[PDB]
Design an enzyme around this catalytic site. Sequence first.
Site, PDB file in Angstrom:
ATOM      1  N   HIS B  65       0.812  -1.214   0.000  1.00  0.00           N
ATOM      2  CA  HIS B  65       0.000   0.000   0.000  1.00  0.00           C
ATOM      3  C   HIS B  65       0.843   1.261   0.000  1.00  0.00           C
ATOM      4  O   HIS B  65       0.453   2.266  -0.555  1.00  0.00           O
ATOM      5  CB  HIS B  65      -0.991   0.006   1.163  1.00  0.00           C
ATOM      6  CG  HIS B  65      -1.871  -1.197   1.187  1.00  0.00           C
ATOM      7  ND1 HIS B  65      -2.902  -1.392   0.279  1.00  0.00           N
ATOM      8  CD2 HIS B  65      -1.874  -2.263   2.008  1.00  0.00           C
ATOM      9  CE1 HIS B  65      -3.516  -2.528   0.566  1.00  0.00           C
ATOM     10  NE2 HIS B  65      -2.890  -3.087   1.630  1.00  0.00           N
ATOM     11  N   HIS B  90       5.643   6.662   6.724  1.00  0.00           N
ATOM     12  CA  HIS B  90       5.308   6.251   5.373  1.00  0.00           C
ATOM     13  C   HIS B  90       4.827   7.475   4.602  1.00  0.00           C
ATOM     14  O   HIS B  90       4.646   8.541   5.194  1.00  0.00           O
ATOM     15  CB  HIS B  90       4.264   5.109   5.387  1.00  0.00           C
ATOM     16  CG  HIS B  90       2.946   5.544   5.955  1.00  0.00           C
ATOM     17  ND1 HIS B  90       2.578   5.353   7.260  1.00  0.00           N
ATOM     18  CD2 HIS B  90       1.925   6.287   5.399  1.00  0.00           C
ATOM     19  CE1 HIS B  90       1.394   5.906   7.478  1.00  0.00           C
ATOM     20  NE2 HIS B  90       0.976   6.527   6.355  1.00  0.00           N
ATOM     21  N   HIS B  92       2.340   9.134   1.102  1.00  0.00           N
ATOM     22  CA  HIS B  92       1.225   9.081   0.165  1.00  0.00           C
ATOM     23  C   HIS B  92       1.575   9.996  -0.987  1.00  0.00           C
ATOM     24  O   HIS B  92       2.129  11.066  -0.762  1.00  0.00           O
ATOM     25  CB  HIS B  92      -0.066   9.552   0.842  1.00  0.00           C
ATOM     26  CG  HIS B  92      -0.445   8.760   2.033  1.00  0.00           C
ATOM     27  ND1 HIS B  92      -1.324   7.688   1.976  1.00  0.00           N
ATOM     28  CD2 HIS B  92      -0.086   8.865   3.342  1.00  0.00           C
ATOM     29  CE1 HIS B  92      -1.454   7.170   3.201  1.00  0.00           C
ATOM     30  NE2 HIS B  92      -0.726   7.878   4.057  1.00  0.00           N
ATOM     31  N   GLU B 103      -2.839  13.741   1.195  1.00  0.00           N
ATOM     32  CA  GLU B 103      -4.116  13.333   1.756  1.00  0.00           C
ATOM     33  C   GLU B 103      -4.893  14.541   2.261  1.00  0.00           C
ATOM     34  O   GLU B 103      -6.013  14.811   1.826  1.00  0.00           O
ATOM     35  CB  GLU B 103      -3.913  12.296   2.856  1.00  0.00           C
ATOM     36  CG  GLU B 103      -3.143  11.074   2.374  1.00  0.00           C
ATOM     37  CD  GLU B 103      -3.746   9.824   2.994  1.00  0.00           C
ATOM     38  OE1 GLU B 103      -3.416   9.548   4.167  1.00  0.00           O
ATOM     39  OE2 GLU B 103      -4.552   9.131   2.329  1.00  0.00           O
ATOM     40  N   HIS B 116       3.666  10.725   6.791  1.00  0.00           N
ATOM     41  CA  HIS B 116       3.048  10.471   8.088  1.00  0.00           C
ATOM     42  C   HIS B 116       4.048   9.755   8.983  1.00  0.00           C
ATOM     43  O   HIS B 116       4.612   8.740   8.606  1.00  0.00           O
ATOM     44  CB  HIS B 116       1.833   9.556   7.878  1.00  0.00           C
ATOM     45  CG  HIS B 116       0.713  10.267   7.213  1.00  0.00           C
ATOM     46  ND1 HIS B 116      -0.291   9.623   6.517  1.00  0.00           N
ATOM     47  CD2 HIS B 116       0.486  11.597   7.110  1.00  0.00           C
ATOM     48  CE1 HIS B 116      -1.132  10.542   6.063  1.00  0.00           C
ATOM     49  NE2 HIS B 116      -0.668  11.770   6.383  1.00  0.00           N
ATOM     50  N   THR B 197      -6.233   6.732   7.733  1.00  0.00           N
ATOM     51  CA  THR B 197      -6.711   7.057   6.394  1.00  0.00           C
ATOM     52  C   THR B 197      -6.807   5.834   5.495  1.00  0.00           C
ATOM     53  O   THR B 197      -7.114   5.987   4.295  1.00  0.00           O
ATOM     54  CB  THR B 197      -5.903   8.171   5.723  1.00  0.00           C
ATOM     55  OG1 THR B 197      -4.617   7.613   5.475  1.00  0.00           O
ATOM     56  CG2 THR B 197      -5.790   9.409   6.582  1.00  0.00           C
TER      57      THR B 197
END
Lengths: 261, 262
Positions: B65, B90, B92, B103, B116, B197
Site C-alpha cells: 500500500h 510512510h 502518500h 491526503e 506520516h 486514512t
Amino acid sequence: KWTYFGPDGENSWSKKYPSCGGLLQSPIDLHSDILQYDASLTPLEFQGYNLSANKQFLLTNNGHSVKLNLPSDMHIQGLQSRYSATQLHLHWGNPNDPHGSEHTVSGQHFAAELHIVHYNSDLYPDASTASNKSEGLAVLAVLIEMGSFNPSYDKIFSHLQHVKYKGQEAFVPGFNIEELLPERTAEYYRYRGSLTTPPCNPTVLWTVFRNPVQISQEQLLALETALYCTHMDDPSPREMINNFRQVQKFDERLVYTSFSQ
Amino acid sequence: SKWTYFGPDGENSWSKKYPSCGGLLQSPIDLHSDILQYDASLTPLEFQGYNLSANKQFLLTNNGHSVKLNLPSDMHIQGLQSRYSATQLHLHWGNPNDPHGSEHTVSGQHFAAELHIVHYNSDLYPDASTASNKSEGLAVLAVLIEMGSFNPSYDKIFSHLQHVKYKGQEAFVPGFNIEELLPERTAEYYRYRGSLTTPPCNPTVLWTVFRNPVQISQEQLLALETALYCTHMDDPSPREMINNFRQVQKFDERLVYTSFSQ
Ligand SMILES: NS(=O)(=O)c1c(F)c(NCCCCO)c(S(=O)(=O)CCCO)c(NC2CCCCCCC2)c1F
Ligand SMILES: NS(=O)(=O)c1c(F)c(NCCCCO)c(S(=O)(=O)CCCO)c(NC2CCCCCCC2)c1F
Ligand SMILES: [Zn+2]
Ligand SMILES: [Zn+2]
C-alpha cells in the site's frame, strides 16, 4: 435508507448501491490541468422552459433535497437526442460552513448547486427507465454564490416553509426556469459522469455552466435552515444540511470546455 | 479482493469490509478557514530520540500500500498528555502525470505528497497494534510535501526505493535525523481528532498537520511515483503503487484547532 451523515453516509452507499463504488463517479473538481477546449460544444437551447403560469408544479421534500417536478415538454435541444426535463433540486452546506456545491472549481466549493435533471426521451419512455441505460440522463448544473437577491430563485425559495418535513409537498405556479440559469450559458464544462446520489448510475452527461448565479445571504440562509430530512412527527428531527457528495477521483480523463479563453 | 485506491476495491468500497471506514471521525480532511479555530493551549511538541544513529539501520518495507520505515520506540513526542512513541513513517503520493497526492488539502489544494510519522501511546499500550483500537491510542504527524528543491534528507529514504519495488520486500536504511524531514516552524500546526486514512479506518488518531510544507524535487517525486508496485514480484497482474491517497472526508461538526492565530 441512505443519508449524507453517520452510518448510512456516502462511504457506505456502495453496500446497497454498487454503482456508487464503480466507474465514472461524480462530482469532480474542475481544474485547469484537465480542461480541454472542444469546438463541438455549441450552445444548448432551452425549449419549453417558460412554464405556463396557469399550471402548477409539485415541490417536494423527499428527505434528501427539495425537488420541483418538471414537465416532459420542457427539453434541451442541441444534444444528439432530445433530453426532456424531469425535476430540479439543490445541494447546499450549512451556516457554519456555507460551501456546499457538489462540483468544485480549482478545489473551491461554491455556496450551493442547482441541478436540472433530464432524460433521453428519444430512446426511453421516462426518467426512471432511462436512469440505468446508455445515454440515459443529462443534468445541467448551476453553481451558486452569495451576492445580490435573486427574485427568480425566490420563486422556489418562497415555498420552502411548506415543504419543511419529509413527505410534505407544495404547488409552485409555472415560471421561466431559464431565469435560474447564469449569464453566458454558452460557456460550460462537459463530461460523462454519474448520479451524485444512490444509485449513482454512470449514465449522466454533465453540463456545468462556467459562470455562477448569485443569491442573497438571506436566501442562502433560508435554504440552509428551512428543511429537515425527517418526518414532522419524528421525535429525533434531523436538519437537511450538507447534502452534497464529496468529489471523486477523476484520473486520466478530461473535462471538455466550450470556452477557449 | 484486497483493498486498493482504484477500481472495485477502491475507497468507496472500503466500508463493505471495514465498517469504521463508513463511521465517524474519518480522515483526511480539507483544512479551510470556516472550520479552523486558534487554541492557545497547543504548545510546541518536543521531538525526542529523532536523531537516529547513522551506524544503526532501520527496516524499510513495501507493504503493498505504501513504503514504510520502521522506527524505534525510544523515539517519542513530548508535549501530549501522554508520551507517544514512534512506530513507523510512510508516504502518500500521486502519479507522474499528476503529482498531487497529499491526503490533507489546504483551502481545497492538494500538495504533491504527504509524510506520516505514526506514534502510539506507549504510556498505556505495549505496541501500536494494541493502541490502534483505543481512543487517542495513536498520534500521527503529517508533513505536506511540495514540488520544489531537491531534499537530501528525504533522499535518505528515496535512494533505497529500487530495493523495495515489490510487495513484501525489505531493505535497511542507515539511521539519520528524522527531524530533518519536518518543516520550518514546527510550533505552527493544525490539530484534530480523526482516523487512520486506510482500512481499518480506526477513529483513534490525534492528527498534527504542520502548517508549513517541505520541498522535494520533481525528480524525487518521479522516482517515488515510478519505483514501486502494490503487487508481489511474481504477480502476473502487476499494479503500480500510485495515487495512494484517500479523498477528503466530511467534517461531521468537528473543528480543527490551530497553534497559530494568523
Ligand atoms: N444530483 S443528481 O442530479 O445526480 C440527483 C440527486 F442528487 C438526487 N437526490 C437529490 C439530491 C439530494 C441532495 O440534494 C436524485 S433523487 O432525489 O431522486 C434520489 C432518491 C430517490 O429516492 C436524483 N434523481 C435521479 C436518480 C434516481 C432515480 C430516478 C430517475 C432519474 C434521476 C438525481 F438525479
Ligand atoms: N495514513 S495512516 O497514518 O492512517 C496509516 C497508514 F496509511 C498505513 N498504511 C500505509 C499507507 C498506505 C498508502 O500510502 C498504516 S500501515 O501500513 O501500518 C497498516 C495498514 C495497511 O497499509 C498505518 N499504521 C497504523 C495501522 C493499524 C494497526 C497496526 C499498527 C500501526 C498503526 C497508518 F497509521
Ligand atoms: Zn443533484
Ligand atoms: Zn498515512
